[model samples]
Structure formats: C-alpha cells, structure tokens
Target: DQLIASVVPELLPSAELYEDPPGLEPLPEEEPLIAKSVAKRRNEFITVRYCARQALSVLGIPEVPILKGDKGQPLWPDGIVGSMTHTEGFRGAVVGRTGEVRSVGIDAEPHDVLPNGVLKSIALPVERDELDALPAGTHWDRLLFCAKETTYKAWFPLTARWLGFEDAHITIDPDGTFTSRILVDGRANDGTVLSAFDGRWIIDKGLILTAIVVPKLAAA
Candidate 1:
C-alpha cells in the first residue's frame, strides 16, 4: 500500500523498520493465520494484519504472526501499547512504549457518500451544521464518519460498551485535523475526558483515510 510504504518509513526509525540487524534477534509472529478475501471484512482483516507487522517491526519484535486479544484489540507483547485500523483503501497502526502512551487507535475510510439517513442518527446539531457547511460533496461526510469511527475504536477498549455514531460530536479545522468530544449522554461520561484522542484525515487516490490516536493520560 502506498500509504503504508510512504508514511511508515518516515514514522519509524530506520533501525526499527528493518529486519535482522547486525546484532539484533528476529521478532516472533503474533498471529499465524489470517485469511484472504475480497469482501470488506476480509480486506480490513488483511489491512490490519499488515499494520500489525509494521507495528511489531518498529518495536523490534518478530513480525511473522498477527494476534488479537479477547476484546478483539491487537495483542502486542508485553511493554508495548498500540492500535490498528483499516478502511476501504488504507490501513495503518501505531505503537509506543507502555508508559509513553496509554492507548492508541488508527482508522481509514474510502471517500464515498454514506447513505443519506446515516448521519442523522449519530450527528449532533452542531455536527450536522458543520457537515452542511462543507462544499456539498461526499468527502465531508466521509471524513466525519471516519473521524467518529476512529474515536469510537479508540475509546472502546477502555469502556467496553458499544457506542454508536451519534453518541459523540466532532469538529474539524480547515487543515484536515479534528477533535472529537463525547457528548454528555454517551457512555464516555464517567468523568474521563478522553482528551488523549486526536485525529488526521487525508484524501489520497480518491480515498478518504482518517486515523485517531489516543495516548494514555497521565495521572494528576
């Protein structure tokens, strides 16, 4: 994938991206069996698998296998905190030292118009207004959808309760960067701010890819 090849190289240090260094040992496989299918679900699985490999490689761990946890989160070996996401045309992952980042998530979405009624359920009045303000194309809606999806995935491991698209509100600036705030009504209102979450979206080759990263917050 061009997205992976272009972004990962710059994101990870040279030593981390390469396999079999002069003195380093090889990393191990985390999940040995991931199937291949053209279906959306299967394609996403493949993207995620690729992301897991990239993440493990950066951490100097074995990359042959990909693994998932009981909650369906990527299971990185001890001492690493990470997240993975995939959409129609893009897939990516992020990893950080355990203490350095508490949690993280990444997501991608194809640039296409969602079903007309789709946004009404999840989008707040403000979010709807923001969407209307866009230049009247599918790109805006796609970005909003991807942003909210990423936020939900980022928060899921912490809450475990399923959240719908309408449960949160998101705001984006002109630069394609965004911030999502859980509404007062959602499951995220147990006093946690979820301030660690941040997002990035880019339009590439007719695809709208978005990702959100949520770092573990520091204790007061």
Candidate 2:
C-alpha cells in the first residue's frame, strides 16, 4: 500500500497500479497454473495477475489469462507492456500503452543484507572491487544484485535472450544511481556491444527499490 502510494504518482495517469491485498484473495477464475502448484507459488501468481488485470482495465482491454511466456516472463496483450514484482508483503504491477512506453521494470527487496556466500556467486570481480571501495553502511553487493535484476527485466524483452548476472557490468555511485555496460557481446555477439543502461534506486522504508524506464531513443 505505501509503495503504491509513492510510485503511482511518478507513473501517473499513464500507468495503473495494483497490489496484493492483505492475506491472499482467491485466485481469479481464469487464472492459470502449472500442474500441482504449491500454496506459496499459487499466492504469488494469483496476486500478481490480479494486479495485472487491474492494470489492463485501464487500456479498456478485456481480462484474459496472463500466462507466463518464455523464461517465465508475463505475457501482456499486443498493445500493452508492463512488469510485476512481489516480495513478502509488497506486490506491484505497472502497465502502460505500448505506444507510450516500450517496457517498464521495477523491483523491491528487503532492506537486509544478502545471505553469506551469495556475494561470491553473483558479484563479478570488478563489481567486488567497487563494492569493497564503498563507504560503510552501503549495501553494495545487494545493490549490484538489484541493478542486474532491474537491468535484466528491462533487457530480456528487448533482446529476447537470457541475461546472466555477469552479462551486465554494473557500477554504483554514492548518489544512489547506477549504470550497466552490456558486457557479453563479442567483447560486446553473445550480447550487444557498447549498449549501456541507466537506473535509479532509493532505500525506502525497509526495502531497496529500483525502477527502469526505456524510452524510444534508447528502445532496444
């Protein structure tokens, strides 16, 4: 609720927001599931789609089952592009007319630090050096993880390929902004060369939030 109140305005009349209600509401009648989905998966799936439906309503689009596409990405209608995220009590969906926005990606993670051993697996050596140079109290590793995630969310839709954690080299600044260099190409063929992405983050309440908006000039 608090997250939406703050985000909705920035997205403004162009995008619609929906959040999961307290406790899980019943799954929508048309919602689909993988065979034998468990309770936790069911709850996350239902709530996020419910939010998607609420978002679709803004485009005067009829409700349809929002199924998972390749790589478990949400498949939006032909003229709509959007993203959904959930963590614990927070769940959000943001959608806009495809003509207006190419793609939208948003993420929220607990403010707590990442588990031990996680940093080694996900952080590239260059990223590690940068994190080490940061001042105290900065959650550098977690921020790097979030930056990669936010970048991937914005990337896959544009490239129609998978992005490993190492695919993007992320740099974080003291000002809370980040930029990623698409590093997997032939130097740049596994991925695109010389492509860069920029994003902003804020540590709000007890979560780290990041949002990425790809405009026409930068549209991949």
Candidate 3:
C-alpha cells in the first residue's frame, strides 16, 4: 500500500511508467493459473501477482483475490476497477474507482530492438512508410510495438473481442503520448458510440513502458 501511494502520481491519465520504489522486494517467481510457457512464466506470474496485491492494498482492500476471467483479464471483485500487466522485466497494475472510471489497462516492454520481420506484421503501411522515411534506428519500431500493444490491451475489455496484430492503427502524439482507434475488425459494436483513447510510453532503464486507462462505461 505504501508503495502504491508513492507511485500513484506517476500513473497518469495517459500511459506512463513510474519507477518502482526503492527497497520493495524483487519481483518473485510463482506461476499463475493462465501462464502457458514453461520458461519464466512463473516469474512473470509472480511479478504480476505482486503488482495486483500492491494495487489492491492501495485501494484499502487488503484481502480481495485477483483472478483470471474468461480471457485472462484481471477479474476485480465487485465495486473495484483494475488492470494488470507484465513484460520481460517489468510488472505493474492500476486500480481506480468503479463509478469514476470503467476500466484500466497497462503494459510494459523491454527497450531492446524488435525483430524487423515481426514488427512488419504489426506496422501499418503508413506506419512502415513513415518508419522508412525516418533516419533509421530501432526507436521507431520499438515505439510502434509498444503503442499497439498497450492499445490492444486497453481495448480488449471494452470490446470483449480478440484483436490481431494488424487489427488496429495508432497515432503517437508528440508529447510522449499516443491515441489508438480500432481499425479493421474486432468486437467493437456496430453502431455504439466510442471515445478516443489517450496513452503514453517511455524508455526507462533500457525498457519501454506503456500504460493506457479506459474509463468504465455502461453497456450499449
């Protein structure tokens, strides 16, 4: 809880990374139920579980259990809204008032360069062209991957549909933030109104961290 209190300010209206407070225990290695891979899946699970506990502790809910829903989404207990995420080396979660905000999502990625071929599948033609026009480096590709990932996770709970790598398009803003819109296909309602999403990402300690919070909403 104290840890959450310290980091709350850095969890922004848009996605951003806050440094883990000094002296917090190193993320542990314990497997959650849904983890599929054998390598470090336990570590990933433990890290995310720690994050979820930290988040709940901050909310004054000390004993609630965080578990997986149908699609591995964090199933918060009644009256609570939360999201959890973990990447190669980072783990975190966000919790907010259920009435004040509908939902929240977060993601993190290592700052290392991505494989070019893998990046190609997620990058739109325009994005790829823009990257090509750039001076050339791994920064653009990493940023794109992070943004799309965060966007997809943010949109998942709302749409309840599985989105592929090529299903969405993103526009990164100049101020270390980005906005994503559902592009091709997914579970978005045919005529339901939707709002634009804002997000943020940054490189920290050689890692790319991103988070997006989609406030709660009523059913359409």
Candidate 4:
C-alpha cells in the first residue's frame, strides 16, 4: 500500500495500480510456483498477485491464475498488458486494457549509487559518460540502471528475448522524460520496427521510480 500510494498518481487514472510490502501474506493455493525456496519469494508472489487481482477486477475480468512463464514473467490476462516490479520493501503492478496501451513497464529501486565497480560493468563507456553530464547530486547511475531495467520489462514480452543494456540505448533528461532506441536487432513490438521508446522517471519516498507506456499507436 505504501508503494502503491507512491506510483498510482503517476499512472493513467484509468489504469489500475496495486502494491503490497513484504511478508504481508502467504502463498495462495493457485500460485504458479517458483524454484526459489526463500521466504521472500513467497511473500512477493502473493503480494503482487493481490495487486494483479485488484487491477483485473477494475476491468471486470475474472480471476485467473497468474502463472509464471518460462522466463518468470507474469502471465497477465488476455487483453491485458502490464508490468510488475519488486524490491525488498516494495511490490507493485500496473495494468492497462489492450485498447488503452500496447504495453507498460515500470521499475523502482532504492535511491542509492551502484556498488563500487558495478556501474562500470552495467553501462558502456559511451553511456558511462552520460552520468558525468547529469546534474550534480542526481542519482544518475541508479537512474540509468532503472531506465534499462524498465526498458527490458517493456522489451521482453514483445520480443520474447533478452535486451541487454547495450541493446537499448537510453538518454535520460533533466526534465524527467527519456528517449530510447532499439540498437541491437531493431525488434518490432508490432509490424512497425520499434524506435524511440519514451519514458518518465521520478523519485518517490526515497525510491527511484521509472515507467514507460507504449501506446497502441507506437506499435503500428
């Protein structure tokens, strides 16, 4: 609920938003299982689905088991395209009916720098220098990481493949919006080749929140 409060205002009002913090509930009988034995796994699983159900209800869609696909992505209901993200303290999902959006991706992370030497590996030299240019005291490294992370969620369901940070080149803006390009395979989310994915990033309650909404026209 704390996390949902942070993001719901940022999303389209017609879209559904739901979230729950860790260990608030236990596994439901219908939960599509995961291999991880950790307690956090179950906690995240149930909380996210709670939000998923809430979102689906908004559309009058019946409850269905939100199973994990081969790659562990959420299996949203037919005619629904949404994204879910979780960190230790937060879990949130956003869903839009197909007519309203082609797809949506969102991510959140603690407002902190990457561990020493880690940022160097996650970003390319060309992109690395982008951090230098961002306004001082902006969490550029975390912003870049969340940008790629958000893009991957946006990328994967359409392509059914991995999108490395190198594959999607992102330019973060001071004004909260960013632009991205499909640099690797130029995979199309639809018949039109994908290009110029746009996004917005913001900080909420100490978490860096970023989201991309690919409207139906972007796919054409």
User: Which of the numbered candidates is closest to the native, going by highest lDDT?
Assistant: 4
How badly does each model clash, as a count of residue pairs?
9, 3, 5, 0
- Candidate lDDT (C-alpha), each: 0.60, 0.69, 0.61, 0.73
What does candidate 3's lDDT look like per residue over 44-163, in tens digits?
555566667666666666755566667877777676766666665566667776666655556666767777587777888887777666554447677778777777666776677776
In model 3, the runs with Cα more than 4 Å from the true position are 1-39, 133-138, 185-192, 216-220
Q: Write the per-residue lDDT of candidate 4 for residues 137-194, one digit (tens) a residue.
A: 7789988898889898877777787888778778899888888777777566566567
Positional deviation of residue 206's Cα in model 3 after best superposition, in angstroms: 0.9
Error of 1 at 170 (Å): 0.7
Per-residue accuracy of model 1 over 1-220 as CA lDDT, tens digit each: 3443332224431111211212322233432333433445554565555656666677787656456667676666677656666554455666666656545555666678777787676677788788888765456776788778777776776576666676667887657678887754433434564533567666666666555555545677
**What is the model-wide C-alpha lDDT for candidate 4?**
0.73
Residue 154 lDDT in model 4?
79
Can you tell me which runs of candidate 4 are displaced by over 4 Å? Answer: 1-32, 218-220
TM-score per candidate: 0.71, 0.81, 0.75, 0.85
Q: For candidate 1, what is the TM-score? A: 0.71
Best by TM-score: 4
- Which clashing pairs does model 3 show? 15-211, 101-216, 102-215, 102-216, 103-216
